[PDB]
Write a protein that binds this ligand. Structure first.
Ligand SMILES: *[C@@H]1O[C@H](CO)[C@@H](O)[C@H](O)[C@H]1NC(C)=O
Ligand SMILES: *[C@@H]1O[C@H](CO)[C@@H](O)[C@H](O)[C@H]1NC(C)=O
Ligand SMILES: *[C@@H]1O[C@H](CO)[C@@H](O)[C@H](O)[C@H]1NC(C)=O
Ligand SMILES: *[C@@H]1O[C@H](CO)[C@@H](O)[C@H](O)[C@H]1NC(C)=O
Ligand SMILES: *[C@@H]1O[C@H](CO)[C@@H](O)[C@H](O)[C@H]1NC(C)=O
Ligand SMILES: *[C@@H]1O[C@H](CO)[C@@H](O)[C@H](O)[C@H]1NC(C)=O
Ligand SMILES: *[C@@H]1O[C@H](CO)[C@@H](O)[C@H](O)[C@H]1NC(C)=O
Ligand SMILES: *[C@@H]1O[C@H](CO)[C@@H](O)[C@H](O)[C@H]1NC(C)=O
Ligand SMILES: *[C@@H]1O[C@H](CO)[C@@H](O)[C@H](O)[C@H]1NC(C)=O
Ligand SMILES: *[C@@H]1O[C@H](CO)[C@@H](O)[C@H](O)[C@H]1NC(C)=O
Ligand SMILES: *[C@@H]1O[C@H](CO)[C@@H](O)[C@H](O)[C@H]1NC(C)=O
Ligand SMILES: *[C@@H]1O[C@H](CO)[C@@H](O)[C@H](O)[C@H]1NC(C)=O
Lengths: 400, 129
């Protein structure tokens, strides 16, 4: 039973790089919670020559504080080693991505249907610490056919090695490379390919070559093959102010299916080629916590109040509204996450020293009791149907 | 057996290969940044008489990038597209497949050329035989 469902529409444009990447940005990752977990399952919806076929993947319990990359714990309806064809990755700021290999079939099909498998949609099911079931439906604008094949190893001759490592963090590659050219601001063209473990990503300059290179930074967009990220891919050509050129490349998404010690080839013209080894940071890039607004509240006595307004895009006639609260750095998943309110609800059992109620305004007034002398921080989250989950960090401190 | 050196490509490059070239070797073609690659990019060393090796298709070609080129949507009666989407600009490719009652003849993939035509081959056909 889904309490909130997010819808997305995805369209594959360029060539298939060997993986399909689906971003899921709207599930709650609660801040100041070493102990918060999330149960995640995924359903892949295939069409096989007109016949519907669902692949159910079980990713177990996410533990964002300690692990950023997840493989399926099990698969139902899939081929052998289907669990090896999918990755779930935490991207930071409450976002995650689902990645599937595109050139190996994850389901069983008959002789003759091997080229008739198309991906229709992906459903992601996400149950948070408060018991709320979240769902994401990613629809393909057009069903995308899987073309199974083995990708041969390819290496490019006549490419200068650099000692500079291209480091990928949360599917974003970042690297700055020194180039040299006879001409000097002289147009500039660059394309890249990232090759490894049967993955082949090609990135090119959208808007074409740089016809006149200005001094300083020359920002230019680049488009990589596969499903595009909502964060744009880009690069910068730094010119000295013969003449020095520095090339910053920030393409995304770059899947760790490439493996460590895959190779980034940079072909540029003013073809010259430099190659750099790619490494995938196993460490989390940044805090996975969803972004929050912080408010400092003072109080006298042991009672304090905070009013939670409607969230952005929350309509006055929203079928479902949910407000939740917990004290920062909770210790016990069994007793610290009972403070959840819906439009029909009371302060549940086990929610101690906190009261809340919706007004006719749909404003949610929360009151905290038994406040000691030290500052205490309350993490308040509000969601509404087809609205934006918003988390408030409210620090209650004794009036001076 | 072994293949001789692969066919050259003007304004492009060929991936690394060791000599002599063994049957089963795959090489990749690419164009020089500004140019666009027209045709299948991977060549395979095969043997038909079990004596000499030969490459399984001709080399692709590189066209100078024409930012203005645009090809109409290609349509194959009896088949359907599995890769490609409008708009089609210079160097973009489409890949076809035939419906179940039909068999394909010709190359399954075509590229939008500078002269606003799909090439280098004709569109494939899907025919019930
Ligand atoms: C509201 O949540 C209930 C379950 O809590 C669900 O059945 C219903 O579909 C939701 N309403 C909307 C409009 O999604
Ligand atoms: C995910 O699937 C597993 C089956 O392996 C099930 O035990 C679990 O309850 C599911 N989680 C959900 C639906 O949130
Ligand atoms: C798919 O085929 C494999 C054989 O390798 C089998 O083990 C698996 O159970 C099959 N999947 C099903 C029956 O869902
Ligand atoms: C590349 O790295 C190797 C590492 O030893 C070094 O020998 C070589 O000089 C470096 N060259 C460049 C251009 O970075
Ligand atoms: C691409 O990015 C550049 C800046 O790097 C900007 O000037 C341009 O308008 C952008 N266009 C698109 C289509 O993203
Ligand atoms: C490698 O560097 C040399 C000089 O630094 C240059 O002449 C050559 O073209 C470079 N190779 C490539 C593939 O760009
Ligand atoms: C890739 O290499 C980096 C740096 O050595 C390391 O931190 C990471 O764990 C490696 N990932 C692998 C081997 O999957
Ligand atoms: C909170 O404490 C104040 C102290 O003056 C009291 O007036 C108010 O009624 C209390 N509110 C609740 C909900 O207990
Ligand atoms: C909603 O009503 C409450 C009274 O409980 C009031 O404090 C608040 O300012 C009102 N908000 C709006 C947006 O009208
Ligand atoms: C206020 O905090 C929320 C946390 O949910 C954040 O998403 C939002 O961006 C913040 N407001 C602004 C104007 O950034
Ligand atoms: C071709 O297939 C269609 C269904 O896809 C069927 O209705 C038709 O009878 C078939 N024709 C032949 C000649 O098999
Ligand atoms: C593909 O096109 C080439 C010409 O570029 C032709 O020689 C070859 O026979 C075609 N392939 C098939 C399967 O017809």
């Amino acid at each position: 039973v889904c309490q909130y469902t997010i819808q997305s529409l995805i369209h594959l444009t360029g060539e298939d790089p060997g993986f399909f990447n689906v971003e899921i940005p709207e599930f709650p990752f609660y801040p100041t919670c070493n102990v918060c977990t999330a149960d995640v399952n995924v359903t892949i919806n295939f069409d096989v020559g007109g016949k519907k076929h669902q692949l159910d993947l079980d990713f177990g319990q996410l533990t964002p504080h300690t692990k950023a990359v997840y493989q399926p714990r099990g698969a139902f309806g899939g081929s052998e080693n289907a669990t090896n064809l999918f990755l779930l990755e935490l991207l930071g700021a409450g976002e995650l991505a689902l990645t599937m290999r595109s050139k190996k079939l994850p389901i069983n099909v008959t002789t003759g249907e091997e080229q008739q498998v198309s991906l229709e949609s992906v459903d992601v099911y996400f149950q948070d610490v408060f018991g709320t079931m979240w769902c994401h439906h990613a629809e393909m604008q057009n069903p995308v056919y899987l073309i199974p094949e083995t990708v041969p190893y390819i290496k490019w001759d006549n490419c200068n090695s650099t000692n500079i490592t291209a480091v990928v963090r949360a599917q974003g590659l970042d690297v700055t490379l020194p180039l040299s050219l006879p001409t000097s601001a002289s147009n500039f063209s660059v394309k890249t390919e990232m090759l490894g473990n049967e993955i082949d990503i090609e990135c090119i300059m959208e808007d074409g070559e740089i016809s006149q290179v200005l001094p300083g930074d020359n920002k230019f967009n680049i488009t990589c093959s596969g499903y595009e990220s909502h964060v744009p891919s880009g690069g910068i050509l730094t010119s000295t102010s013969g003449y020095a050129y520095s090339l910053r490349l920030t393409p995304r998404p770059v899947s760790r299916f490439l493996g460590n010690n895959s190779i980034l080839y940079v072909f540029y013209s003013g073809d010259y080629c430099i190659q750099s080894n790619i490494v995938f940071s196993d460490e989390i890039p940044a805090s996975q916590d969803m972004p929050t607004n912080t408010t400092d509240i003072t109080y006298v006595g042991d009672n304090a109040t905070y009013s939670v307004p409607m969230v952005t895009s929350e309509d006055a006639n929203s079928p479902n509204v949910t407000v939740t609260a917990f004290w920062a750095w909770p210790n016990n998943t069994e007793t610290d996450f009972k403070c959840k309110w819906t439009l029909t609800s009371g302060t549940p059992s086990g929610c101690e020293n906190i009261s809340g109620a919706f007004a006719s305004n749909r404003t949610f007034d929360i009151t905290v009791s038994g406040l000691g002398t030290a500052p205490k921080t309350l993490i308040i989250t509000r969601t509404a149907t087809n609205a934006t989950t918003t988390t408030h960090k409210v620090i209650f401190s004794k009036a001076p | 057996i072994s293949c001789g050196s692969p066919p050259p490509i003007l304004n492009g490059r060929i991936s690394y290969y060791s000599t002599p070239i063994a049957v089963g070797t795959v090489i990749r073609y690419s164009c020089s940044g500004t140019f666009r690659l027209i045709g299948e990019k991977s060549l395979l060393c095969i043997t038909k008489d079990k004596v000499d090796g030969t490459w399984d298709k001709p080399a692709p070609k590189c066209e100078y990038f024409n930012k203005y080129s645009s090809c109409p949507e290609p349509i194959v009666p009896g088949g359907y597209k599995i890769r490609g989407s409008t708009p089609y600009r210079h160097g973009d490719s489409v890949t076809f497949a035939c419906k179940t009652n039909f068999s394909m003849n010709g190359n399954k993939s075509v590229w939008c050329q500078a002269n606003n035509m799909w090439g280098p081959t004709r569109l494939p056909t899907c025919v019930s035989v």
